[PDB]
Homo-oligomer: 130 residues x 8
Amino acid sequence: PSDYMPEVADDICSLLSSGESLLKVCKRPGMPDKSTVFAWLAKHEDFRDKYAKATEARADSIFEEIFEIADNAIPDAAEVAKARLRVDTRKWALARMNPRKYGDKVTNELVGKDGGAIQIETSPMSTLFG
Amino acid sequence: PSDYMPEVADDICSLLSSGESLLKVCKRPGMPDKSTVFAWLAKHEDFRDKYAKATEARADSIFEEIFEIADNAIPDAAEVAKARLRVDTRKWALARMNPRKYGDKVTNELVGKDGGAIQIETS
Amino acid sequence: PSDYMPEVADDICSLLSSGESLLKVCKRPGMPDKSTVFAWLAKHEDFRDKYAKATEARADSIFEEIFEIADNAIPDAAEVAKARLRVDTRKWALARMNPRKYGDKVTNELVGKDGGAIQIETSPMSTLFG
Amino acid sequence: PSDYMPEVADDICSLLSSGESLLKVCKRPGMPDKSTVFAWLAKHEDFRDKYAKATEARADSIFEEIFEIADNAIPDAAEVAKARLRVDTRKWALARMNPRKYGDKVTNELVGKDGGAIQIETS
Amino acid sequence: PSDYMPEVADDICSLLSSGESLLKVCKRPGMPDKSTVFAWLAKHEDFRDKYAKATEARADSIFEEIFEIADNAIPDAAEVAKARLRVDTRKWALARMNPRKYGDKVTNELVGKDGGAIQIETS
Amino acid sequence: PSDYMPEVADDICSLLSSGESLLKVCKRPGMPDKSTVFAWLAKHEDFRDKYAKATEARADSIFEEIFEIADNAIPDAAEVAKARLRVDTRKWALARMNPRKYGDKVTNELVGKDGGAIQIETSPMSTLFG
Amino acid sequence: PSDYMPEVADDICSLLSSGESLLKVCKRPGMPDKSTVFAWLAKHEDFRDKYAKATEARADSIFEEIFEIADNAIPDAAEVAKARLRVDTRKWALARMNPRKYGDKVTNELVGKDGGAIQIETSPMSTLFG
Amino acid sequence: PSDYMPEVADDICSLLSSGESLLKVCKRPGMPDKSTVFAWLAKHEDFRDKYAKATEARADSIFEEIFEIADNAIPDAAEVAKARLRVDTRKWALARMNPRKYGDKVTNELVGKDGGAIQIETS
């Protein structure tokens, strides 16, 4: 399939939503190749909008999946290394799929010299940087 | 079972709140599948909230789990590597489940050049 | 035991204070299961307050323990890897139990372009972000 | 083939935009070598732009590739190490190809001493 | 021995101040157990302070210890891994015992877009 | 060759531009040693300017090369470790050759206490830090 | 030796200045034990001042030493691991001995939303944080 | 040879400036030992400066060395580990020899809650 087919695009969104990766989806019977999916995306705003929603749902599904990949790892050195790689790749991807939810979280307690106030001295410009 | 139904959603929460993961909750008979749970959440703000607090309770349970996974690890190379992966995955997840509580903690002492005041020039 | 029992809650606080983990405490004779402890926490402010104090003390105990875990590690590859995991898990946990005391510590010397003053240029808003 | 020629440059872009890397594009018959592609870009701002969007499309393709590399890795020590290197290299590259999209994501909660207000003294 | 007693607390400090850890101090005859030492500290601000300076002295001793642990490590895989764990644990601990002295050190050169001035818009 | 030779300097710039390292270039027939190249740089602004341009081009070439080094790694433990080292060294170098293009990229969402506004309290100086 | 001896303290400063560690120095013939050195430090400002100077010099010596430890490492797995540990320990220590010289170095290019200006909105306090 | 002497110090600089390390420079006949070189620097500001530029030239040489160490590493486990240590040590050192040039490079896009403006309240 090369021509845009909304029924197929809808199915793609559903599968992605459930956690499946695009390349894996594109290997299913009657699915377009990844290049074609990207081509559809580029020219159909209805697909793009639903695909963005599916990406959010996809991330929520993957967040649950990482526990299973780790917990069910076959206790063999190479198998554990692969499980680790699969989990690390997902962790990285999740932060990009939904940065607000899955990005890193840090609380910075900001203090100044010797634990006192932050000391700031302002001066007029000394070079032409405007 | 696909139709959004309170009490059932209320059930799932109490389940997660007791430390149970979403997968296990959904593998129970009469329980909606993962996708259905998400669909619900997405279209109901009330469920989003109650689920959120269950998620914070789940985090508190996982926090204690990591000590046990580490301390009880089998002293075999692959098993220790697996335990480390299980712990690392939980640590990462906890920060997302309750960022204010389980996020990273840094104290930054901010000083200026040579430990003097921070020098700023403005236009 | 399912019903809240202050004598038992007090004992829990004492054991945690000494460095023992909750799941380990809950395996002792006559202790409630972890779910029950969390249930007690949720509905009894007297327990919650004493449990928070116990968590602070727990962290101070663990801070001493990490030296022992490392120093006494059996010099076998797997045993050292486990000791490392036990220590790393505690280090991570300590920062969350008492962020002010056990969080990361950084001193940032802040300077500007070419080691001079930090150069700032202010402008009126160019888009509607208010 | 060294002379800057639109349509050919337009071709390369569509090629990269479909996920193909620069090396492969340049190994095709009638295709300028790497150096020539760069020379072009450097002296033509129009090509720099179209190439930039092709680069963002290429990033989107690589983003999906990393899942497959990880999930389909052969369960052998050296092969898993190789797969990890392939993935790590792509992750690093993606942030440079589209920094706004694939860069690191952090939420910093900024507070002052003891969780009070941030204290500043100015001269 | 549970009753808070100066001179005994004064003793512990001088002990820690000479590089000795709390465990060893508490394993001595007539010495309060760990819990008792903490109880004391918690309810006495004077002890909290003297203990704090002993802790800074202890840090200075540990700082020199890490060189010896590294340099004298037995050239065997597991022993080197153990030495690395001993050193890493001490490095992490030192930053907490004296954050101003043993915390991380960074110099950040702050510049704006393209190395120009930092651009800010305010409402 | 010790005396500055523009034809040779031009060749050096071309080879570097294509991704080759300086020490490797300096092993080619009739090339000056690295010390000599640095000596030429120090005293000839025409060379320095063209060398800086070549460094930018060099980085763009290396950015493509890292994919090949990883993808074509011989699946042997030591060979993969070497490929990793070669890639890591290039990643580090690229950020210094063109910091704007190849430096790290972070988006920091800045918030204040409890996810509200960042709370700032200003006070008059309490010590003489001016 | 327990009593403070300036001649011995001077020697200590010289040895440290050259890169030697304190515990190693204290094993030399006729040297005080480390506890004694710290005791001397505590009560003699002349020693403390010269010891601080020696620490700066010590760091400069170690900075050169790390190259040698790495370059001369015996090509055996355990020996390389030990060399790495020796180098890593020194790197960490150097930043604390002279933070200005040997601390981490970062250049942060600060930009705002979508690569434009940093957008700041100020508001009156909404809670009592003063 | 302990007495501070220009031309000799000038010599050392040209030596370092050509990529040679301080150890090798000091192992040459008629060359002051390490300690003497430092003593000099400490008490002479002129030498501190000339040495500083030699140090920046030395950094530029080491920068090219790291490519060769990596690319020419012997494909044996311990040798690759050694090469990695040699490279890592040089990378770390370079940032200290010329921080503006070889320090870390980050671009931070600073935004506020939910990608809106950065919200500040002042007292």
